[PDB]
Design an enzyme around this catalytic site. Structure first.
Site, PDB file in Angstrom:
ATOM      1  N   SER A 178      -3.452  -1.148 -33.922  1.00 34.92           N
ATOM      2  CA  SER A 178      -3.695   0.026 -34.855  1.00 34.92           C
ATOM      3  C   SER A 178      -2.609   0.724 -35.676  1.00 34.92           C
ATOM      4  CB  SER A 178      -4.543   1.092 -34.162  1.00 34.92           C
ATOM      5  OG  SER A 178      -5.880   0.579 -33.949  1.00 34.92           O
ATOM      6  N   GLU A 188      -2.397   3.748 -27.297  1.00 34.47           N
ATOM      7  CA  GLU A 188      -1.167   3.047 -27.004  1.00 34.47           C
ATOM      8  C   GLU A 188      -1.364   2.058 -25.836  1.00 34.47           C
ATOM      9  OE1 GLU A 188       1.549   4.268 -29.895  1.00 34.47           O
ATOM     10  OE2 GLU A 188      -0.326   5.213 -29.209  1.00 34.47           O
ATOM     11  N   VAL A 232      -6.217  -4.160 -36.859  1.00 31.81           N
ATOM     12  CA  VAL A 232      -7.540  -4.581 -37.254  1.00 31.81           C
ATOM     13  C   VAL A 232      -7.814  -4.173 -38.706  1.00 31.81           C
ATOM     14  CG1 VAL A 232      -9.953  -3.749 -37.013  1.00 31.81           C
ATOM     15  CG2 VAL A 232      -8.628  -4.719 -35.001  1.00 31.81           C
ATOM     16  N   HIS A 266      -3.618  -0.649 -30.881  1.00 26.90           N
ATOM     17  CA  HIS A 266      -4.456   0.279 -30.123  1.00 26.90           C
ATOM     18  C   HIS A 266      -5.777  -0.443 -29.694  1.00 26.90           C
ATOM     19  CE1 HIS A 266      -2.435   3.819 -32.555  1.00 26.90           C
ATOM     20  NE2 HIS A 266      -1.652   3.353 -31.594  1.00 26.90           N
ATOM     21  N   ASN A 272      -4.860   1.019 -39.894  1.00 26.89           N
ATOM     22  CA  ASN A 272      -6.291   0.731 -39.981  1.00 26.89           C
ATOM     23  C   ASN A 272      -6.916   1.271 -41.244  1.00 26.89           C
ATOM     24  OD1 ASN A 272      -6.401  -0.454 -37.298  1.00 26.89           O
ATOM     25  ND2 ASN A 272      -6.182   1.643 -36.527  1.00 26.89           N
TER      26      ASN A 272
END
Lengths: 153, 520
Positions: B1, B455, B70, B23, B244
């Protein structure tokens, strides 16, 4: 100015850290991928074997109903069979790093059958194809095409 | 993330910097990260990857490193089929389905298995699933003919130069992810990677829903090459980043705009307040050191308090309810950092849940909407303050219920607990603005909550000679029954005391504990 001298492993060995981190030294690629395979079986053995079991589409058969939907999802999209293809389609150099990785998980189990869980022993002889299949499941049918998405559920 | 790469020019010492900060769920198994270091005569890689993967996705070595986030690349499409006469209407007529008879075994409970027949139906689009409500949906997934994913990452992370790196990247074998890159040679790069079907029409939200499956009008067959995708290399801004957010502010002096790409690639929605902080932490700072870089990663700001408390608070002070009045003074006195000692933060999360939805995304509520022209400061203000105040009222009841008081210290309810280690938490929801994320779970009946996600692997690398890198794994390096390496680093994470990551033989030779010779 050039980077610092690369280290040339003279024998294969894993030097583990105080936090459980493995430094895998291999006299060649395949050896490194085996040490790596051993390392992972040592640190996350049970879930990796469970995951591979599911990627062969054998979830319902090894563990039952709670694993049936992933099974139907993976057979319908033909993931286990395509993983067999992707494995045959690898280049030889790499197919050997993959077989080396599978051989390490296996060696760890055989040498440490106790430091390894009952429900996942039936999975055990794992293969380069199992490796390719889990990655395929993860990448294309978890990340990209998730079942909640096409299934709506 | 979170991903950041900064060019020599923006650093004090002149060496590029990388942040690896994925993440993910702290519990789902295939999402577990594991850290390792592989050394061979011809290569070397250090990093984290999801268990079961033979190759490291978040890696680095003396020459380079990369990281992922992502991006949500839409690599499959779900077609709504028009069933009719035992086939599906398609173009002019009814086409019969391809039918395969499969079968699988089912564990019984008494140890036995029973054969279960499974019939796989496929339309020209792909396999067919019947949703619980009866919709027949055919899934067409792109990239099924890309066997080389693992080798791609492998030849990518062991590349000898950017040029060699991008050639590997170019094979289009990795189907999603934003992938950030950095060199001891100084180039940094951000790629909106993935395998995307070339399409003739359709906004991305169109392709994410049930595309009609009655026409070859929507059956794509090809996919985009790497150079058709958003990418940024060594920008004027001197850094790239991605938290993201859609790929429209990957660097600050921006280098392209939504008009420059097919609208089905990525959305054009508001950026996270965490995404906005990412751009500000990078752009606003110069002459960065590994240390300041690492300090910036800990940022835990309640950016959304900055966008709303100004309008919110005076509105609440004129509320008749003394407790609402007292809530607003507790909020007004807050330095707006999700710190362990903060007595206003929980109360604020609870207000934000109502004002901005259960996931804090949600723009109704703001007075001035989000805009790409002011990408890092626009969702702003409160539209209807009286409404917002009635929300603060409800929120006080919630906070009291959930935590036993409206002023309980953030870090006494928010806890990081692994095995028998229980340390105070700090930082929080990404959508509220916290850059370092810990998506706290709902509270148990003592008002204690833990992180459900956030995290996991965090590393920061300076590509000096030799390389210097620090990192931490929230949930340690093993979850195998009985290891002393599960609850191992959590209290370190609570203090943000990172371990030096050791890549040099001499450093490894010295930290050895546990040791295994093998031969294959």
């Amino acid at each position: 100015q050039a980077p610092i001298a690369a280290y040339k492993p003279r024998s294969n060995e894993i030097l583990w850290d105080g936090y459980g981190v493995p430094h895998i030294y291999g006299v060649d690629a395949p050896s490194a991928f085996y040490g790596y395979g051993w390392a992972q079986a040592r640190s996350h053995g049970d879930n990796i074997l469970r995951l591979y079991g599911e990627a062969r589409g054998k979830g319902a058969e090894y563990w039952g109903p709670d694993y049936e939907q992933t099974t139907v999802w993976l057979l319908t999209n033909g993931v286990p069979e395509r993983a067999q293809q992707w494995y045959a389609q690898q280049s030889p150099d790499f197919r050997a790093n993959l077989d080396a990785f599978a051989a390490g998980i296996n060696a760890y189990a055989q040498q440490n059958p106790d430091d390894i869980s009952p429900d996942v022993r039936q999975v055990l002889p794992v293969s380069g194809a199992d490796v390719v299949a889990h990655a395929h499941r993860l990448m294309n049918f978890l990340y990209v095409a998730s079942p909640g998405r096409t299934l709506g559920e | 993330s979170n991903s950041w790469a900064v060019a020599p020019g923006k650093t004090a010492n002149g060496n590029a910097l990388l942040l690896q900060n994925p993440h993910l769920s702290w519990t789902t198994d295939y999402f577990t990260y594991y850290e390792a270091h592989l050394v061979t005569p011809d290569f070397e890689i250090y990093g984290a990857t999801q268990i079961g993967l033979p190759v490291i996705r978040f890696a680095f070595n003396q020459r380079m490193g990369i990281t992922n986030t992502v991006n949500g690349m839409v690599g499959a499409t779900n077609y709504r089929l028009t069933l009719q006469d035992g086939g599906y209407l398609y173009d002019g007529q009814v086409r019969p389905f391809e039918r395969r008879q499969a079968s699988y075994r089912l564990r019984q409970a008494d140890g036995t298995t029973v054969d279960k027949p499974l019939e796989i139906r496929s339309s020209v689009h792909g396999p067919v699933f019947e949703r619980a409500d009866g919709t027949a949906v055919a899934v067409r997934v792109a990239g099924l003919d890309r066997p080389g994913m693992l080798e791609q990452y492998f030849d990518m992370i062991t590349a000898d130069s950017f040029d060699d790196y991008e050639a590997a990247l170019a094979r289009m074998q990795v189907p999603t992810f934003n992938i950030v890159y950095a060199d001891r040679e100084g180039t940094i790069n951000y790629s909106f990677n993935g395998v995307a079907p070339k399409r003739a029409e359709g906004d991305i939200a169109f392709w994410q829903g049930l595309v009609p499956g009655d026409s070859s009008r929507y059956l794509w067959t090809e996919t985009h090459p790497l150079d058709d995708l958003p990418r940024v290399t060594n920008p004027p801004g001197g850094f790239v980043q991605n938290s993201n957010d859609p790929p429209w502010t990957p660097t600050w002096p921006v280098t392209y705009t939504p008009k420059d790409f097919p609208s089905y690639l990525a959305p054009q929605t508001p950026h996270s307040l965490r995404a906005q902080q990412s751009v500000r932490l990078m752009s606003e700072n110069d002459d960065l050191t590994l240390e300041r870089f690492m300090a910036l990663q800990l940022s835990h700001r309640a950016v959304m308090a900055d966008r709303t408390l100004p309008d919110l608070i005076p509105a609440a002070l004129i509320d008749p309810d003394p407790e609402v009045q007292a809530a607003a003074r507790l909020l007004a006195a807050w330095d707006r950092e999700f710190t362990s000692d903060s007595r206003a933060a929980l109360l604020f999360e609870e207000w934000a849940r109502l004002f901005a939805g259960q996931n804090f995304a949600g723009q109704a509520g703001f007075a001035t909407p989000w805009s790409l022209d002011k990408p890092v400061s626009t969702p702003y203000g409160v539209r209807d303050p009286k409404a917002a105040v009635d929300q603060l009222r409800t929120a006080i009841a919630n906070t009291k219920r959930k935590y036993g008081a409206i002023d309980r210290p953030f870090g006494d309810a928010s806890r990081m607990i692994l095995n028998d280690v229980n340390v105070p938490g700090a930082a929080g929801y990404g959508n509220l603005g916290s850059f370092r994320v810990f998506t706290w779970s709902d509270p148990d009946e003592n008002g204690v909550r833990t992180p459900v996600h956030g995290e996991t692997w965090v590393a920061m690398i300076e590509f000096s000679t030799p390389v210097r890198a620090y990192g931490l794994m929230s949930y340690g390096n093993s979850r195998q029954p009985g290891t002393t390496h599960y609850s191992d680093q959590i209290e370190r994470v609570s203090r943000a005391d990172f371990r030096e990551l050791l890549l040099r033989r001499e450093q490894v030779e010295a930290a050895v504990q546990e040791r295994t010779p093998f031969n294959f």
